[PDB]
Amino acid sequence: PVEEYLVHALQGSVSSGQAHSLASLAKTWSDNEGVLLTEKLKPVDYEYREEVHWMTHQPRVGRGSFGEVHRMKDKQTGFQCAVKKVRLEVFRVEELVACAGLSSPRIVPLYGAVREGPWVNIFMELLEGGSLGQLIKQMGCLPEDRALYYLGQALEGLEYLHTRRILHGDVKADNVLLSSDGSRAALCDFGHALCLQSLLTGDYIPGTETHMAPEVVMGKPCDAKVDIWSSCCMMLHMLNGCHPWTQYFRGPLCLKIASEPPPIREIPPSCAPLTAQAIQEGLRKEPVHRASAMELRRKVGKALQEVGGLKSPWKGEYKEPR
Ligand SMILES: CNC(=O)c1c(C(N)=O)nc2n1[C@H]1C[C@H](C1)c1cc(F)c(C#C[C@@](C)(O)c3cc(C)on3)cc1-2
């Protein structure tokens, strides 16, 4: 009833507010409007405009797949954080409906979103350790204890997302962000997310092909289990230093994903038996037989105990990939 009235109050200005307001407004995104969720990102006279009220840091340094994530400062408060830029014409409402209102240590905090012309600017906490995707490139591949340790947190955030019937859509190293000392890991980027009740309908952008579950490829119906397949492709990447499939096959990868057996051949043979068995359970081609988020987190927490807890230095020494 009053619903439609509240949306109208939000349109056309930028305000301090709360996640439910941000999602109300975000649903209308298919001049300068938006809601900021934290006291250190403040609008000025109904506006929040890039280079006026917030500046990107220095010569531009991008950091996502598309170089669309930047460091930024709020000009008035001096606060710093991260912007992801999204083209308004391709903006998926779920990128903010599916994550506004969340609160979880395993999930990157959302600071707001402001539309400004053709840009949806999405603001979040800046985590200084960078992405697990970078960590892997820097260090070659990760010690088994570290890889399990991060995989467990990733599954911890997938637990949170899943029992709220949210599917992240693109679990992968590039979307886990590490704290400054490397001890805390959090999921970012909901641009592939999907609220729950085939994936190949609607505003659907597909996720990273190498981490793509077999049901996702063959068109079949999809539930939270596709995240688990991905997290284990991520695991292999952490261990081997490269994505599954990229070695053995050259052509259109999604064809091999549906015909071939799950890529457990790529599990390092020096992994303790419970590492290997857990990677296998989250890589069952049929989502019914595949482990859930809660099962695999438990299973991985114990695999971590079996190899003596986490002992490797966070930025230890380089390790040659496969
Ligand atoms: C040093 N760290 C970084 O450069 C950094 C930060 C950051 N926050 O510092 N974010 C990202 N990156 C790296 C990793 C790449 C670029 C990357 C890609 C993304 F699509 C996103 C995102 C996102 C959101 C806005 O959909 C989101 C929703 C909810 C909840 O949380 N986030 C962030 C980052």
Please tell me the number of Cα atoms within 13 Å of 185 on its side-chain side.
25
CA pseudo-torsion sign 204, 210, 216, 217: positive
What residues does each domain of the chain span?
1-126, 127-322
Nearest atom (ligand 1) to Cα of 122: 25
Residue whose tokens read 């010569």: 59
Q: 3-state secondary structure string, the chain?
A: CCHHHHHHHHCCCEEECCHHHHHHHHHHHCCEEEEECCCCCCCECCECCECCCEEECCCCCECCCCCCEEEEEECCCCCEEEEEEEEHHHCCCHHHHCCCCCCCCCECCEEEEEEECCEEEEEECCCCCCEHHHHHHHHCCCCHHHHHHHHHHHHHHHHHHHHCCEECCCCCHHHEEECCCCCCEEECCCCCCEECCCCCCCCCCCCCHHHCCHHHHHCCCCCCHHHHHHHHHHHHHHHHCCCCCCCCCCCCHHHHHHHCCCHHHHCCCCCCHHHHHHHHHCCCCCCCCCCCHHHHHHHHHHHHHHCCCCCCCCCCCCCCCC
Strand partners, 81: 72
Atom of ligand 1 nearest to the CA of 84: 25
Instruction: Please state which of the four CATH numbers 3.30.200.20, 3.40.630.30, 3.40.190.10, 1.10.40.50 is assigned to the domain occupying 1-126.
Output: 3.30.200.20
Q: Which of 45, 74, 145, 170 is catalytic?
A: 170
Task: Give the C-alpha separation, 22 to 213, whole Å.
Answer: 32
Tokens of 94: 């779920």
Q: Is 174 a catalytic residue?
A: no
Q: Spell out the CATH class of 127-322.
A: mainly alpha
- Residue type present at position 280: Q
User: How many angstroms separate the CA atoms of 4 and 27, rounded?
Assistant: 12
Kindly report the backbone phi and psi dihedral angles of residue 207, in degrees, each rounded to the nearest multiple of 5, phi listed first: -85, -170
Q: Dig out the tokens for 206 from the structure.
A: 């597909």
Distance 287 CA to ligand 1 centre (A): 28
Please enumerate in sequence order all residues whose Cβ is within 8 A of that of 23, keeping only pairs 6 or more positions apart, or say none: 96, 97, 100, 101
Rounded Cα gap, residues 108 and 95, in angstroms: 13
Residue 180 CA to ligand 1 center (angstroms) comes to 15
User: What separation, in Å, do the N-terminal and C-terminal C-alpha atoms of the chain show?
Assistant: 60
- What resolution (Å)? 2.7
Which residues does a 6 A CB cutoff place in the pocket of ligand 1?
A: 63-64, 69, 82, 84, 95, 99, 107-108, 110, 122, 124-127, 130-131, 174, 177, 188-191
